[PDB]
Amino acid sequence: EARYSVMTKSELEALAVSAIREHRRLLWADQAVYEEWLRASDDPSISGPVLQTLQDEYVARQKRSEAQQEELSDILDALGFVPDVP
Amino acid sequence: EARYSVMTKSELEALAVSAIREHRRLLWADQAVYEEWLRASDDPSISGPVLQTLQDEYVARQKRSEAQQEELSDILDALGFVPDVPF
Amino acid sequence: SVNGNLRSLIDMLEAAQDGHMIKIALRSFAHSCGYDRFAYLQKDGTQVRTFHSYPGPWESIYLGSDYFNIDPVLAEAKRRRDVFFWTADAWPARGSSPLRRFRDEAISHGIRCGVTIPVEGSYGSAMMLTFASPERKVDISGVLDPKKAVQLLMMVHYQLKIIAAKTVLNPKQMLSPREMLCLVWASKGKTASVTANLTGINARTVQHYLDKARAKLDAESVPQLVAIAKDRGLV
Amino acid sequence: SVNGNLRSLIDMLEAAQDGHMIKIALRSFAHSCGYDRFAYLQKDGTQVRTFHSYPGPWESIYLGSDYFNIDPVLAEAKRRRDVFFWTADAWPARGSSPLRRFRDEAISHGIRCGVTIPVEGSYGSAMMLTFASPERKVDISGVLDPKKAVQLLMMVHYQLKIIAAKTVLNPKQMLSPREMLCLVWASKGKTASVTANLTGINARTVQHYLDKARAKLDAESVPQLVAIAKDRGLV
Numbered sequence: 001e002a003r004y005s006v007m008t009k010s011e012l013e014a015l016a017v018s019a020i021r022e023h024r025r026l027l028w029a030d031q032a033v034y035e036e037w038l039r040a041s042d043d044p045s046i047s048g049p050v051l052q053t054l055q056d057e058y059v060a061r062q063k064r065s066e067a068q069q070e071e072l073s074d075i076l077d078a079l080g081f082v083p084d085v086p
Numbered sequence: 087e088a089r090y091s092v093m094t095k096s097e098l099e100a101l102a103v104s105a106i107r108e109h110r111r112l113l114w115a116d117q118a119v120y121e122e123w124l125r126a127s128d129d130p131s132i133s134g135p136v137l138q139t140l141q142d143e144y145v146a147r148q149k150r151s152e153a154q155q156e157e158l159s160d161i162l163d164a165l166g167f168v169p170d171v172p173f
Numbered sequence: 174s175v176n177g178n179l180r181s182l183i184d185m186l187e188a189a190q191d192g193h194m195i196k197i198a199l200r201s202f203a204h205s206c207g208y209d210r211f212a213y214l215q216k217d218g219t220q221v222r223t224f225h226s227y228p229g230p231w232e233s234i235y236l237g238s239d240y241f242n243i244d245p246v247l248a249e250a251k252r253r254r255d256v257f258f259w260t261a262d263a264w265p266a267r268g269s270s271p272l273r274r275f276r277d278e279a280i281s282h283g284i285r286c287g288v289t290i291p292v293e294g295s296y297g298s299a300m301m302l303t304f305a306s307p308e309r310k311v312d313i314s315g316v317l318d319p320k321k322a323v324q325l326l327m328m329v330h331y332q333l334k335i336i337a338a339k340t341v342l343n344p345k346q347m348l349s350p351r352e353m354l355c356l357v358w359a360s361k362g363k364t365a366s367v368t369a370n371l372t373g374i375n376a377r378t379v380q381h382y383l384d385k386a387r388a389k390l391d392a393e394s395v396p397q398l399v400a401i402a403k404d405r406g407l408v
Numbered sequence: 409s410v411n412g413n414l415r416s417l418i419d420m421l422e423a424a425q426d427g428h429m430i431k432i433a434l435r436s437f438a439h440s441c442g443y444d445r446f447a448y449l450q451k452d453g454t455q456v457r458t459f460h461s462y463p464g465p466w467e468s469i470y471l472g473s474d475y476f477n478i479d480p481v482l483a484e485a486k487r488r489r490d491v492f493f494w495t496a497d498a499w500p501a502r503g504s505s506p507l508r509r510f511r512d513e514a515i516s517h518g519i520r521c522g523v524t525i526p527v528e529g530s531y532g533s534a535m536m537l538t539f540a541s542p543e544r545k546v547d548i549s550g551v552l553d554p555k556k557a558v559q560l561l562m563m564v565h566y567q568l569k570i571i572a573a574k575t576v577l578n579p580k581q582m583l584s585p586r587e588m589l590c591l592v593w594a595s596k597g598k599t600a601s602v603t604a605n606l607t608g609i610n611a612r613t614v615q616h617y618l619d620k621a622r623a624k625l626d627a628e629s630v631p632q633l634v635a636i637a638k639d640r641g642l643v
């Protein structure tokens with residue numbers, strides 16, 4: 001709450017842009033693991049053990065993704081707006 | 087083995103007509119359990135033991151089904167044709 | 174009594190049926206030794222998996238800011254492979270480095286000292302179990318039997334793998350990462366447009382993903398979607 | 409080096425999906441360290457379980473004599489917690505005691521010396537991993553890392569439990585009742601119409617079920633479906 005408020009607008013903007021880039025990089029990475037899990041659960045050629053690994057990946061990534069999103073949300077709050085990320 | 091050869095056409099036909107109905111009955115019942123087993127596992131709620139009970143019933147039924155179907159096939163071979171049995 | 178409490182923990186872990194029971198057992202051990210928190214961490218590549226009793230907000234910060242690459246404890250764990258004591262009161266600051274920020278934030282969250290049990294797993298996987306305290310010098314590394322500490326770490330590792338195996342999720346019923354991000358931003362008060370600008374997902378597609386999220390969780394509206402997601406611990 | 413082969417064993421065990429693979433992994437490690445056979449033993453109060461590569465004739469004698477009660481190796485294993493070297497050479501060679509007969513037989517079966525890794529588990533349970541050799545003295549107890557030794561014992565222990573577990577089949581991977589019947593009648597040379605007439609399943613839906621069966625078994629044609637089903641013992 002006060003972790004970011006103490007920074008100036010120009011310091012926050014730089015952090016936000018960087019955090020938004022990570023937010024998107026993680027999204028593309030996680031969505032791909034999920035599609036492989038979804039595909040595998042319908043492929044009779046995959047064993048339960050291999051399938052369980054994909055399930056655990058999805059779960060670990062979900063927790064990390066929420067954490068990074070919470071960190072970005074707090075930055076946004078102190079910044080006041082959503083910067084453009086090219 | 088081939089004691090169906092010593093049976094008359096009338097005996098064989100009766101055996102086939104009742105073996106066909108039995109065949110159809112097991113199918114209906116077995117399909118129901120499989121679908122239920124399909125549903126139960128599809129639920130992350132149902133425990134492991136309750137999912138195993140359904141698996142065993144499936145493995146058991148599939149076994150009797152094979153035995154029953156093989157027998158019907160032998161009767162039909164000795165008969166020489168497939169009798170028409172209503173639904 | 175440390176090693177005695179350890180043998181007792183080992184028995185408690187064997188009878189533990191779920192994650193909650195493991196936490197209770199680990200927490201009791203922690204208290205008996207003078208600590209108040211524990212953390213199990215597994216790291217493969219850039220992927221970190223945890224099971225701990227550290228405060229929720231610290232997990233968001235640690236996992237969300239990739240502190241795994243700056244934490245002196247993970248660094249210590251791979252430089253040496255045996256039980257060790259560590260204290261933030263040993264990572265000098267004298268500046269505003271990312272290291273001082275990490276140290277001060279850990280302290281503000283009650284993590285000041287601890288003992289860590291490090292184990293190198295298969296395929297370069299790293300795992301460790303640590304007990305932390307907000308006080309300055311709670312050190313049991315001198316009396317903890319090394320072989321028994323490793324045993325405990327392996328038990329925790331496999332018990333968790335076994336409990337994870339008890340639940341087989343069907344991806345068709347789980348929200349995709351896409352739907353998930355849109356659901357969290359909505360729960361944070363962002364419109365479809367603000368969400369699109371954050372995620373890179375088109376504004377109209379965002380609304381479509383929320384609709385899919387609703388069908389998967391049987392919600393009639395987004396406020397309900399959020400309600401059901403909260404109840405299930407999804408978010 | 410011993411630890412280099414141990415790190416390899418650890419990776420191999422992680423990848424083991426069944427007992428056969430675990431046995432091959434443990435055999436590779438044993439060979440690399442200068443040993444020939446290995447044996448994992450678990451004692452839970454009364455019952456005793458083992459996973460080993462000792463010769464068949466020696467196992468029948470061992471069980472058919474309850475040699476567990478006299479094996480100096482087991483008695484010593486619970487008498488200590490470090491990796492130790494043992495040799496049948498230190499046991500009675502003359503006289504008529506039961507150990508003298510145990511000595512002669514063990515050696516006649518190639519189990520002359522070895523190193524054992526002992527670990528006390530939960531509830532007083534006892535576990536141990538031994539590597540044996542028909543030779544005079546092959547002793548790695550002085551180079552093997554105590555902590556890794558325990559890690560290895562723990563993996564083998566849990567790996568074996570995660571196998572002794574029930575079969576557990578996946579409905580999606582099994583042929584459904586109506587699918588199995590269409591396939592069997594097809595293998596009997598019946599057409600879709602005769603199959604329908606027999607099972608009650610509609611004619612045009614028969615080919616639909618056959619295509620479904622092919623997908624589950626990964627067959628490009630009905631004749632291949634029959635060949636696969638025959639090989640898996642389903643028809």
Ligand SMILES: CCCCCC(=O)CC(=O)N[C@H]1CCOC1=O
Binds near residue numbers: 223232
């Ligand atoms: C989010 C849970 C993180 C667990 C991290 C871990 O295993 C090692 C550790 O104790 N790091 C300590 C030191 C300063 O803060 C910590 O948390």
Ligand SMILES: CCCCCC(=O)CC(=O)N[C@H]1CCOC1=O
Binds near residue numbers: 522538
């Ligand atoms: C046959 C399975 C028995 C395994 C026994 C074991 O773990 C300990 C051991 O190596 N005892 C040795 C010493 C002489 O014979 C043995 O077998």
